[model samples]
Target: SPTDKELVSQAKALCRDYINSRLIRAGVSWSGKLAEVSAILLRLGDELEYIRPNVYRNIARQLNISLHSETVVTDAFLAVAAQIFTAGITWGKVVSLYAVAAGLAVDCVRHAQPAMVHTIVDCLGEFVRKTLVTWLKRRGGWADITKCVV
Candidate 1:
């Protein structure tokens, strides 16, 4: 159970090292939810590196690993997506809630959407839960760095 500061710091560091460095194309959504999601992903990458460097590194360093930003995100969810799915209602609902919640967390809710705050909380909570599950699983199994030497 790392603090937000700790997790966020880790995330930013990882992104700066791997994904950010390789991002040659600057998309339009870079500044908003995309940025937030990307930031969190960086943290997840950091968490993975922190846990088991060899396996995760092997997986990540593959020559043909084409993890789009979206996949990077969902894969990042592999760290916690299922847990959230179980407790936070359906996966689709979790996604909707997460989207709305992310909007609120970033103050993206333009109109008076006070009620959406709770939904945001739920999304973020589930996200963190799922992330923890992933962090622990991969850490325990050392599964991130599996590379086929073909």
Candidate 2:
């Protein structure tokens, strides 16, 4: 029974926490360079419309951390994409949702580890098909004739 804004906000906050936890595990604490790891992601959400190559570049710039591999970059951006998609769907701005998600997935396949790609696939599948269906039902779109017409 959460509002859309609350749902989106929770998703973003949780993703930020998850990313910071992973960064800590990798021995790369945000420390003093960035006030908070989540702040960079929050700014990225405000600045970018979708996941783009520049998104990675900007994140790297914000973190000021020299990234060595595609996996590292992809993992961070994947979390950002999840945050953005969750908000977008909640706001009903889903035009480029699939494109952005697929772009990230393809990027992962080409550059990240196999497990990264697999996890992205699983999340994408669930978010697109399952989450949206449930959202539609909850929003009363399920009873509308034009709900899935497109």
Candidate 3:
């Protein structure tokens, strides 16, 4: 059986690739749309979920604290924002991803902003959801992982 860390690493690797591909596509599509790129960057903020899993979960697990919905929402936003910033993309899809990410992130922040700090799993799950759905919708990519995780 895969340990949590192992499974987590695998998931992160996959999502990382997904964001990279999306960013490449987005950059290509919005070649002349520098404004759009900057706009996307603005929404991204500073927090990146690439390593939040360990931090987010360790705190939650050790403190025995329960997060409000805002925590989850902000986490989702930061997670997606970081991936989008670091990964590649097409302008059109970037716009869409930004929209979706913003919606998801806003939902998380409004309902879940961290009480003290944040954990990584929160970002991980949000990235998984945003990236997975974006990949399915924008790329029509499919994988066994979908059913496995779902």
Candidate 4:
């Protein structure tokens, strides 16, 4: 398992690797328990995929970030995460934010804008650091999330 410090130390670079990593939901493993976080979210994202077009519309409505523009999509993505967390940060909401990132990553991929995933995941790391890291550290390692997943 990665210590909170280890996770934080490598967050941005890890997210960079995370966004490019393959997803094999069947039965894969991670060297550290925290490593599974992105995989977990990506799975959640896949479940939410059917509603993404609607999601993009909802984002456009909420933020006025045009759907077709790849440049502004980063704003749309981060704004979506912020909106989700603005309700209050719970483990569930935190997890939803990660899942949402995965969904957006796929959207970028679909439009041949896979390069955007770098920025997207990088932003996710920063957002987690700014918005959730202390919360996570004070609570304990990422395992606390699984404990409360009930």
Candidate 5:
């Protein structure tokens, strides 16, 4: 059985590698065109579910705490954000994960619970803003990062 942490780590690693590959393909000039890169990030975010079993459940638990009300959920989202900031991932990668979580929350609202919609959106906004602050401080400020995170 895949533990929650393992599943979350695997999904995040998948997103990180996906972004890294795109950056390499774009080469040194990639900075000027991060808009496209951001798009790629969102696409990867959507595709993350295919990477491994239980990944979505794990992310929802982590990123949608208000919806599920579990510490595991909070821990999972924090761990992934920490991993991205502490290691090799870029601003785009971080935003990609956030976007995915937000998308999932919206999906849940449309599919089943309508009330969870606001909580999900609020949590995601806070998550993105928090990550953006760290990313801006540590990454030394990339304006386009706002386009992705905010």
Candidate 6:
């Protein structure tokens, strides 16, 4: 079995490719729209990247000290996803992973596991390829989302 560090590295490699330019006819009818979806997720990730440390100072206090260990180091960042919203989470809800990861990084550092930061981001990106794509499909693609916003 791969160790935690090994798994994180594996996921980091996978996510790097996933985000780079793999939004082809990569086994989906919504290929071009996948680029749109990537654009949205990628842009959202950029906006959140700036706040990773800045926002974590107070968000780190007294919610769940054990949460860091529980949420970090996964193949898919589901634990973060689960906490960020309710059961009826939408594609928009996917954006909250950054806030969750922001909290997670400080929590991880508090415990001295800096590698968990990459684990959070890498697995969070993996979520785009695995979880986000499927949800967009089940909901009839990103087009459905674009039509709704004001």
- Per residue, candidate 4 scores C-alpha lDDT tens digits across 1-150 of 456556565555545544455322312212275566555544444445445656532333445544536568777777777778776777667655655565566555655566766777777877877777867776675656556433
- Against the reference, the lDDT scores of all candidates come to 0.36, 0.41, 0.38, 0.58, 0.46, 0.48
Better of 3 and 4 by lDDT: 4
- Runs in model 3 deviating more than 4 A are 28-122, 125-150
Name the lDDT of candidate 5: 0.46
RMSD to the true structure for each prediction, in A, is 14.1, 15.0, 15.4, 5.9, 13.5, 11.5
- Candidate 3, residue 127: the lDDT equals 57
Better of 1 and 6 by lDDT: 6
Cα-based RMSD of candidate 1: 14.1
Residue-level lDDT of model 6, residues 1-150, one tens digit each, is 333343344334434433332222122213165455445555555455456545333345524454556443452246556566546656556545544544455456556665575666666655555545545456554445444333
Per-residue lDDT for 1-150 in model 3, tens only? 444344344444443334333334334212123333343333332122223434322222322334545454455446445655465644333333334343232222333342311333345545546444454444422222233222
Predicted structure 2: clash tally: 0
- Candidate 1 per-residue C-alpha lDDT over 1-150 given as tens digits, one digit per residue, 9 for 90 to 100: 444444434433332333332222212123243355444444444454457555444332322323323334334334343544555342233233233223222232223333433343444444544454344243331122122010
In what order do the candidates fall by lDDT, top score first? Answer: 4, 6, 5, 2, 3, 1
Please identify which of the two predictions, 2 or 4, would achieve the higher lDDT against the true structure.
Answer: 4
lDDT of 1: 0.36
Tens digit of per-residue lDDT, candidate 2, span 55-131: 43234444342442455545554555567656546522332333343334334333333244345444544454545
Q: C-alpha displacement of 109 in model 1, angstroms? A: 2.3
Cα lDDT for residue 110, candidate 3? 35
TM-score of each: 0.24, 0.33, 0.28, 0.65, 0.41, 0.41
Which candidate, 4 or 6, would have the higher lDDT against the true structure? 4
